[PDB]
Amino acid sequence: NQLKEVFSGIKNSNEQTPEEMASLIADLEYRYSWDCSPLSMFRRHTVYLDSYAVINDLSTKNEGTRLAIKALELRFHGAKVVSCLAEGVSHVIIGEDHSRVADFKAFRRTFKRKFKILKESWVTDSIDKCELQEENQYL
């Protein structure tokens, strides 16, 4: 009750930015070892989807499939869904369509930091366990 009353006292605080808030959250989790919580465990990893017919294009959305709900679930659990295929991306999810796997592998090779290729079923199975399952079985 005291903590609730104290929190209600503060009016508003909107001075930071999403990157700064994410960095502060990650720092707090690392300092206090709060990574064992069922959620927020995907925060340290950025996630991409193959929801665009052409990679790195914002005018060919494939909305109307299970990929959108999968991304929304990942974001809710704590995953940072990124829309631009930056060099810092670490997790990529590919659905039943494997046509562009070669392009993803080539981009991974080109980038200095390599991101493991992952499938949509891995997260679907891992939500129930609420833990990071080994990617060797879903590469």
Binding site: W34, S37, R66, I69
Partner: protein, 201 residues
């Protein structure tokens, strides 16, 4: 190219059903071709734009209304409150249809159909067209049913996912509040120890 088959009962022989097919290129206004068959012999005729316009002018009605009535009659578009009588004189090879209405007969249209010497070819063509149409409809229905099953499965999956997400959302707040209270109590202990040390010093 569009075609429409229909079944009619000629008043001359109210014991068998005659199949009449109306075929038009793009719209009924431009004209049509009427082929009537009883299963043994076929009679084919054509009506052009000029004939339809002349018929509409003679009966003193708008072209659109007359065309709509013709479609309602020939193409089996009749509603609940309507009835039509079709009669074909084979000796004169003269077909015509009227709109029966409360003991009042109004002549709606009339054509002269010439018997074709090869009814078998037209019968086979009509049967083949019907078979193709039914096959296409069945394939489309199967595809649509498969799509519906897939969408239902996806909907169930997403609904269960939302149920789980909303169930966990409420506990999310309690969990973070408990973590915050624990860390704040630790800070409370640290400040208490510091104050005790300062007082001792």
């Amino acid at each position: 190219m569009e075609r429409k088959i229909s079944r009619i009962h000629l008043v001359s022989e109210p014991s068998i059903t005659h199949f009449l097919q109306v075929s038009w290129e793009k719209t009924l206004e431009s004209g049509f071709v009427i082929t009537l068959t009883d299963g043994h012999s076929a009679w084919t005729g054509t009506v052009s734009e000029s004939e339809i316009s002349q018929e509409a002018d003679d009966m003193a009605m708008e072209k659109g209304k007359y065309v709509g009535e013709l479609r309602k009659a020939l193409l089996s578009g009749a509603g609940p409150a309507d009835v039509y009588t079709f009669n074909f004189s084979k000796e004169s090879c003269y077909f015509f249809f009227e709109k029966n209405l409360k003991d009042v007969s109004f002549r709606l249209g009339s054509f002269n159909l010439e018997k074709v010497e090869n009814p078998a070819e037209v019968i086979r063509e009509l049967i083949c067209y019907c078979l193709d149409t039914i096959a296409e409809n069945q394939a489309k229905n199967e595809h649509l049913q498969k799509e519906n099953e897939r969408l239902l499965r996806d909907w169930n999956d997403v609904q269960g996912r939302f149920e789980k997400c909303v169930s966990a959302k409420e506990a999310l707040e309690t969990d973070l509040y408990k973590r915050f209270i624990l860390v704040l109590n630790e800070k409370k202990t640290k400040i208490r120890s510091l104050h005790n040390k300062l007082l001792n010093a």
